């Protein structure tokens, strides 16, 4: 099981450039991996407080004292107990693909593939990668038949790595993209809170279509999100 960790050639993941230029790998390397996560070091004040509160408590000698309070409640498993649980499931549990879950995986694969085709105007190995994640979820609960609950969990993990690195719902997305291309010139520096009070309070678009249209235009090097995404700045055409 290949578990590598690469690093950008510029020292940081440049969001203004294309993902294919910041990564010094070929096209045949990203297609072989199953999940490609991007750990962005976002400078958040609310996130740095909880992170600093955990590292300080560990180095203060409270790491050994918190082990007796967490293991007694049944929330953390030791390393010795986890070693015998992985080998037990890899030799006695043999999950397969149920016919009820095969139709959901085949229908949802065309929906994700159709979303990237519109933006370009996903390979065969990417479909088999979701099957391995779905089969691995049934091995945790010792279930030889993969139900439909493990399919939605594998899609959520696939969209948060693969998609994050590249009737009435589809009609509102195309209308929102055409309206922003005309109501905002090439280089408009409009805040995120300003555009939210013009399309949601007017009873014309929903909140789900606002974040989806802003993310799709960012991958095309057209909309640059500055100040932690609080200011929308246009770059490309």
């Amino acid at each position: 099981s290949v578990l590598a960790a690469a690093n950008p050639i510029y020292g940081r993941y440049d969001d203004l450039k294309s993902p294919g230029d910041n990564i010094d790998f070929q096209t045949t390397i990203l297609s072989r991996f199953d999940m490609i996560f991007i750990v962005k070091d976002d400078h958040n004040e609310e996130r740095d407080i909880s992170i600093a509160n955990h590292v300080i408590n560990i180095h203060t000698g409270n790491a050994n004292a918190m082990q007796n309070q967490q293991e007694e409640n049944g929330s953390e498993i030791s390393i010795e107990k986890m070693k015998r649980y992985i080998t037990y499931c890899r030799l006695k549990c043999a999950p397969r693909l149920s016919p009820q879950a095969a139709e959901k995986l085949s229908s949802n694969f065309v929906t994700i593939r159709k979303q990237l085709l519109i933006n370009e105007l996903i390979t065969i190995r990417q479909l088999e990668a979701i099957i391995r994640i779905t089969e691995s979820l049934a091995k945790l609960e010792l279930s030889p038949i993969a139900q439909e609950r493990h399919v939605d969990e594998a899609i959520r993990l696939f969209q948060a790595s693969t998609m994050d690195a590249a009737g009435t719902s589809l009609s509102e997305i195309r209308r929102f993209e055409q309206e922003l291309k005309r109501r905002l010139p090439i280089g408009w520096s409009t805040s995120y809170q300003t555009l939210r009070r013009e399309f949601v309070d007017t009873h014309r678009f929903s909140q789900l279509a606002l974040d989806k249209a802003l993310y799709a235009l960012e991958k095309h090097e057209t909309i640059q999100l500055r100040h932690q995404g609080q200011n929308i700045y246009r770059s490309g055409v």
Binding site: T27, T28, S31, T123, I124, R125
Partner: protein, 93 residues
């Protein structure tokens, strides 16, 4: 020591039909859906042309070279594996 009529009648019978070019093309890769224009080129490539040889000694080629350029894993990686098992002599490089 070192050691390095029934089949003929069935060949001429099927050749009388005028649809033998589309039937034999779709039978090369049954698992690969579509790509009817690409499968027709592999048929003429495996059969080969005619090695024209002149009288002075200048020989001419007869092989057909096919180049596929497209997106990765688009009936290209699995298509090359079927030709290695169909032809009588093929080297996977």
């Amino acid at each position: 020591t070192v050691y390095p009529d029934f089949d003929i009648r069935n060949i001429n019978k099927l050749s009388k039909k005028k649809d033998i070019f589309d039937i034999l093309s779709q039978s090369l890769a049954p698992s690969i859906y579509g790509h009817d224009h690409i499968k027709k080129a592999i048929l003429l490539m495996l059969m080969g042309g005619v090695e024209k040889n002149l009288e002075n000694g200048s020989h001419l080629r007869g092989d057909i070279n096919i180049l596929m350029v497209g997106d990765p894993s688009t009936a290209k990686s699995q298509l090359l594996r079927f030709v290695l098992n169909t032809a009588s002599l093929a080297i996977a490089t």
